[PDB]
mmCIF file of C-alpha atoms in Angstrom:
data_model
loop_
_atom_site.group_PDB
_atom_site.id
_atom_site.type_symbol
_atom_site.label_atom_id
_atom_site.label_comp_id
_atom_site.label_asym_id
_atom_site.label_seq_id
_atom_site.Cartn_x
_atom_site.Cartn_y
_atom_site.Cartn_z
ATOM 1 C CA UNK A 22 96.734 91.053 97.375
ATOM 2 C CA UNK A 23 98.507 87.901 96.136
ATOM 3 C CA UNK A 24 96.272 85.009 97.253
ATOM 4 C CA UNK A 25 98.669 82.111 97.921
ATOM 5 C CA UNK A 26 98.250 78.754 99.692
ATOM 6 C CA UNK A 27 100.530 77.203 102.327
ATOM 7 C CA UNK A 28 100.820 73.996 100.241
ATOM 8 C CA UNK A 29 102.054 75.438 96.932
ATOM 9 C CA UNK A 30 103.654 78.690 98.151
ATOM 10 C CA UNK A 31 105.429 78.302 101.514
ATOM 11 C CA UNK A 32 106.530 81.496 103.300
ATOM 12 C CA UNK A 33 107.643 80.801 106.890
ATOM 13 C CA UNK B 19 74.113 103.629 132.185
ATOM 14 C CA UNK B 20 74.435 99.843 132.607
ATOM 15 C CA UNK B 21 71.336 97.621 132.884
ATOM 16 C CA UNK B 22 70.563 95.978 129.518
ATOM 17 C CA UNK B 23 73.168 93.178 129.527
ATOM 18 C CA UNK B 24 75.671 94.686 132.034
ATOM 19 C CA UNK B 25 79.366 94.325 131.088
ATOM 20 C CA UNK B 26 80.881 96.843 128.642
ATOM 21 C CA UNK B 27 81.064 94.772 125.425
ATOM 22 C CA UNK B 28 77.311 94.026 125.463
ATOM 23 C CA UNK B 29 75.495 97.139 126.741
ATOM 24 C CA UNK B 30 74.574 98.494 123.255
ATOM 25 C CA UNK B 31 76.611 101.619 124.009
ATOM 26 C CA UNK B 32 80.174 101.271 122.679
ATOM 27 C CA UNK B 33 82.288 101.791 119.539
ATOM 28 C CA UNK B 34 81.642 99.717 116.383
ATOM 29 C CA UNK B 35 83.092 96.173 116.249
ATOM 30 C CA UNK B 36 79.728 94.445 115.496
ATOM 31 C CA UNK B 37 78.988 93.295 119.123
ATOM 32 C CA UNK B 38 75.414 92.184 118.273
ATOM 33 C CA UNK B 39 76.996 88.886 117.159
ATOM 34 C CA UNK B 40 79.986 86.796 118.241
ATOM 35 C CA UNK B 41 81.324 86.310 114.694
ATOM 36 C CA UNK B 42 81.956 89.795 113.174
ATOM 37 C CA UNK B 43 80.230 90.096 109.773
ATOM 38 C CA UNK B 44 83.081 91.896 107.970
ATOM 39 C CA UNK B 45 82.662 92.341 104.198
ATOM 40 C CA UNK B 46 80.435 89.931 102.213
ATOM 41 C CA UNK B 47 83.308 87.778 100.748
ATOM 42 C CA UNK B 48 84.219 86.527 104.250
ATOM 43 C CA UNK B 49 80.717 86.478 105.794
ATOM 44 C CA UNK B 50 79.649 84.200 102.915
ATOM 45 C CA UNK B 51 82.890 82.163 102.789
ATOM 46 C CA UNK B 52 81.926 80.912 106.246
ATOM 47 C CA UNK B 53 78.222 80.908 105.290
ATOM 48 C CA UNK B 54 76.966 79.071 102.168
ATOM 49 C CA UNK B 55 79.692 80.664 99.997
ATOM 50 C CA UNK B 56 79.808 83.980 98.083
ATOM 51 C CA UNK B 57 78.856 83.980 94.380
ATOM 52 C CA UNK B 58 79.676 86.883 92.027
ATOM 53 C CA UNK B 59 79.557 86.972 88.208
ATOM 54 C CA UNK B 60 82.878 87.154 86.340
ATOM 55 C CA UNK B 61 83.165 86.204 82.652
ATOM 56 C CA UNK B 62 86.110 83.929 81.807
ATOM 57 C CA UNK B 63 88.460 84.914 78.954
ATOM 58 C CA UNK B 64 90.188 81.714 77.772
ATOM 59 C CA UNK B 65 93.215 80.340 79.661
ATOM 60 C CA UNK B 66 96.942 80.940 79.091
ATOM 61 C CA UNK B 67 99.438 78.167 79.914
ATOM 62 C CA UNK B 68 102.971 78.759 81.155
ATOM 63 C CA UNK B 69 106.256 76.866 81.039
ATOM 64 C CA UNK B 70 108.253 78.536 83.838
ATOM 65 C CA UNK B 71 109.163 77.220 87.311
ATOM 66 C CA UNK B 72 106.630 77.443 90.165
ATOM 67 C CA UNK B 73 106.536 78.782 93.744
ATOM 68 C CA UNK B 74 108.002 82.162 92.737
ATOM 69 C CA UNK B 75 106.980 85.799 93.263
ATOM 70 C CA UNK B 76 109.367 88.365 91.688
ATOM 71 C CA UNK B 77 107.907 91.889 91.883
ATOM 72 C CA UNK B 78 109.314 92.763 88.435
ATOM 73 C CA UNK B 79 109.323 89.337 86.742
ATOM 74 C CA UNK B 80 105.687 88.772 87.788
ATOM 75 C CA UNK B 81 104.535 92.071 86.245
ATOM 76 C CA UNK B 82 106.502 91.516 83.010
ATOM 77 C CA UNK B 83 105.307 87.953 82.309
ATOM 78 C CA UNK B 84 101.810 88.481 83.765
ATOM 79 C CA UNK B 85 101.262 91.768 81.889
ATOM 80 C CA UNK B 86 102.847 90.294 78.737
ATOM 81 C CA UNK B 87 100.430 87.361 78.328
ATOM 82 C CA UNK B 88 97.493 89.357 79.742
ATOM 83 C CA UNK B 89 98.389 91.961 77.088
ATOM 84 C CA UNK B 90 98.101 89.483 74.193
ATOM 85 C CA UNK B 91 94.695 88.399 75.541
ATOM 86 C CA UNK B 92 93.043 91.798 76.122
ATOM 87 C CA UNK B 93 94.605 92.876 72.787
ATOM 88 C CA UNK B 94 94.762 89.893 70.380
ATOM 89 C CA UNK B 95 91.342 88.716 71.622
ATOM 90 C CA UNK B 96 89.128 91.743 72.394
ATOM 91 C CA UNK B 97 86.916 91.416 75.493
ATOM 92 C CA UNK B 98 88.615 93.515 78.201
ATOM 93 C CA UNK B 99 87.651 97.138 78.934
ATOM 94 C CA UNK B 100 90.401 99.659 78.099
ATOM 95 C CA UNK B 101 93.080 97.668 76.237
ATOM 96 C CA UNK B 102 91.707 96.336 72.929
ATOM 97 C CA UNK B 103 94.096 98.168 70.576
ATOM 98 C CA UNK B 104 96.142 101.374 70.937
ATOM 99 C CA UNK B 105 99.726 100.697 69.803
ATOM 100 C CA UNK B 106 101.261 99.022 72.876
ATOM 101 C CA UNK B 107 104.519 97.480 71.664
ATOM 102 C CA UNK B 108 107.152 98.233 74.351
ATOM 103 C CA UNK B 109 110.059 95.820 74.935
ATOM 104 C CA UNK B 110 109.442 92.452 76.649
ATOM 105 C CA UNK B 111 111.828 91.731 79.531
ATOM 106 C CA UNK B 112 111.556 87.915 79.523
ATOM 107 C CA UNK B 113 113.965 85.095 78.596
ATOM 108 C CA UNK B 114 112.411 81.769 79.663
ATOM 109 C CA UNK B 115 109.169 82.454 81.566
ATOM 110 C CA UNK B 116 105.890 82.080 79.629
ATOM 111 C CA UNK B 117 103.945 79.718 77.337
ATOM 112 C CA UNK B 118 101.066 80.953 75.146
ATOM 113 C CA UNK B 119 97.586 82.483 75.553
ATOM 114 C CA UNK B 120 94.803 80.015 74.681
ATOM 115 C CA UNK B 121 91.794 81.955 73.360
ATOM 116 C CA UNK B 122 89.622 78.860 72.811
ATOM 117 C CA UNK B 123 86.754 80.327 74.873
ATOM 118 C CA UNK B 124 86.917 84.143 75.061
ATOM 119 C CA UNK B 125 83.817 85.324 76.962
ATOM 120 C CA UNK B 126 82.218 82.671 79.203
ATOM 121 C CA UNK B 127 80.098 84.190 81.989
ATOM 122 C CA UNK B 128 80.657 82.083 85.128
ATOM 123 C CA UNK B 129 79.478 82.614 88.726
ATOM 124 C CA UNK B 130 82.541 82.867 90.999
ATOM 125 C CA UNK B 131 81.292 81.074 94.134
ATOM 126 C CA UNK B 132 83.785 80.975 97.030
ATOM 127 C CA UNK B 133 83.017 78.689 99.985
ATOM 128 C CA UNK B 134 85.138 77.525 102.931
ATOM 129 C CA UNK B 135 87.719 75.579 100.892
ATOM 130 C CA UNK B 136 85.393 75.327 97.886
ATOM 131 C CA UNK B 137 86.080 77.887 95.129
ATOM 132 C CA UNK B 138 83.470 76.585 92.671
ATOM 133 C CA UNK B 139 82.907 78.685 89.547
ATOM 134 C CA UNK B 140 79.410 77.894 88.231
ATOM 135 C CA UNK B 141 79.091 78.038 84.427
ATOM 136 C CA UNK B 142 76.444 80.533 83.238
ATOM 137 C CA UNK B 143 77.198 79.809 79.552
ATOM 138 C CA UNK B 144 76.058 76.287 78.594
ATOM 139 C CA UNK B 145 74.398 75.495 81.944
ATOM 140 C CA UNK B 146 77.387 73.756 83.558
ATOM 141 C CA UNK B 147 79.702 74.165 86.585
ATOM 142 C CA UNK B 148 83.455 74.853 86.298
ATOM 143 C CA UNK B 149 84.568 72.567 89.134
ATOM 144 C CA UNK B 150 82.198 72.185 92.098
ATOM 145 C CA UNK B 151 85.136 72.283 94.573
ATOM 146 C CA UNK B 152 88.163 74.016 92.992
ATOM 147 C CA UNK B 153 90.317 74.285 96.146
ATOM 148 C CA UNK B 154 93.128 71.713 96.443
ATOM 149 C CA UNK B 155 95.726 72.127 93.668
ATOM 150 C CA UNK B 156 95.822 75.556 91.939
ATOM 151 C CA UNK B 157 99.203 77.322 92.375
ATOM 152 C CA UNK B 158 99.013 81.138 92.361
ATOM 153 C CA UNK B 159 96.061 83.517 92.804
ATOM 154 C CA UNK B 160 95.734 87.325 92.892
ATOM 155 C CA UNK B 161 94.136 90.330 91.153
ATOM 156 C CA UNK B 162 94.368 93.680 92.978
ATOM 157 C CA UNK B 163 96.547 96.726 92.212
ATOM 158 C CA UNK B 164 99.298 94.928 90.247
ATOM 159 C CA UNK B 165 98.702 92.163 87.652
ATOM 160 C CA UNK B 166 95.755 93.844 85.875
ATOM 161 C CA UNK B 167 94.842 96.626 88.334
ATOM 162 C CA UNK B 168 91.175 95.944 87.497
ATOM 163 C CA UNK B 169 90.565 92.318 86.440
ATOM 164 C CA UNK B 170 91.367 89.142 88.408
ATOM 165 C CA UNK B 171 94.006 86.525 87.499
ATOM 166 C CA UNK B 172 94.685 83.187 89.216
ATOM 167 C CA UNK B 173 96.849 80.401 87.773
ATOM 168 C CA UNK B 174 95.204 77.065 88.619
ATOM 169 C CA UNK B 175 96.338 73.437 88.224
ATOM 170 C CA UNK B 176 94.819 69.940 88.552
ATOM 171 C CA UNK B 177 94.233 68.128 85.229
ATOM 172 C CA UNK B 178 97.858 68.665 84.143
ATOM 173 C CA UNK B 179 101.181 69.753 85.670
ATOM 174 C CA UNK B 180 101.162 73.078 83.789
ATOM 175 C CA UNK B 181 100.145 76.250 85.656
ATOM 176 C CA UNK B 182 97.348 77.898 83.634
ATOM 177 C CA UNK B 183 96.944 81.638 84.320
ATOM 178 C CA UNK B 184 93.160 82.191 84.334
ATOM 179 C CA UNK B 185 92.149 85.677 83.123
ATOM 180 C CA UNK B 186 88.628 86.839 84.026
ATOM 181 C CA UNK B 187 86.960 90.277 83.939
ATOM 182 C CA UNK B 188 83.555 91.896 84.618
ATOM 183 C CA UNK B 189 83.249 90.244 88.052
ATOM 184 C CA UNK B 190 80.660 92.833 89.254
ATOM 185 C CA UNK B 191 81.670 94.242 92.677
ATOM 186 C CA UNK B 192 84.823 92.219 93.403
ATOM 187 C CA UNK B 193 88.467 93.414 92.840
ATOM 188 C CA UNK B 194 89.421 93.953 96.530
ATOM 189 C CA UNK B 195 86.475 92.113 98.119
ATOM 190 C CA UNK B 196 86.955 89.158 95.729
ATOM 191 C CA UNK B 197 90.671 89.021 96.574
ATOM 192 C CA UNK B 198 89.637 88.687 100.241
ATOM 193 C CA UNK B 199 87.344 85.745 99.360
ATOM 194 C CA UNK B 200 89.815 83.608 97.378
ATOM 195 C CA UNK B 201 92.352 84.226 100.177
ATOM 196 C CA UNK B 202 89.782 83.132 102.776
ATOM 197 C CA UNK B 203 88.808 79.774 101.214
ATOM 198 C CA UNK B 204 92.536 79.497 100.320
ATOM 199 C CA UNK B 205 93.580 79.033 103.978
ATOM 200 C CA UNK B 206 90.603 76.760 104.795
ATOM 201 C CA UNK B 207 91.903 73.196 104.317
ATOM 202 C CA UNK B 208 94.368 72.348 101.496
ATOM 203 C CA UNK B 209 95.571 69.544 103.816
ATOM 204 C CA UNK B 210 97.237 72.017 106.216
ATOM 205 C CA UNK B 211 100.240 69.838 107.062
ATOM 206 C CA UNK B 212 101.992 72.728 108.862
ATOM 207 C CA UNK B 213 105.776 72.306 108.541
#
């Protein structure tokens, strides 16, 4: 449930 | 028994999975995110600023620093529901990860509207609008089991380069559904560069 964006938080 | 619209996924005789429409419906946070944009009512409780690095998760460091500041707000500045004062000292596992809770505006009813890439929080206090399109900078957002286990917290960013953990409560039917909304509009645009 941790809303995160692909611009600030990158996970890939 | 086929005759209405033949086929099997359109003969009004199957399991759930909407079917009547091509979209899906799902909960209201998503159906509205694509529609005009959901709009709940969560009162803001001041804003706490931090001074730690960014782009970090930490399952233990996030609960110690997030619960630490959130503790000084629901305690030092009454307003929460079940954490105003009851002797809650405990240690404070934290060396260099925090800033200070700013209780300049404790209690500011605001409509949390979430649209496709447009998290605008209307202002129901002095007839205003906290950002008509808050969905481009920000930094971290959440509010489910961990963090507060009841309220919602999302550190934003835009006017300055300092993550500001936003603490809000009394959303009125949100918690899990609201988390699904902010996540929805979250992956809408944000200049998806795609590495």
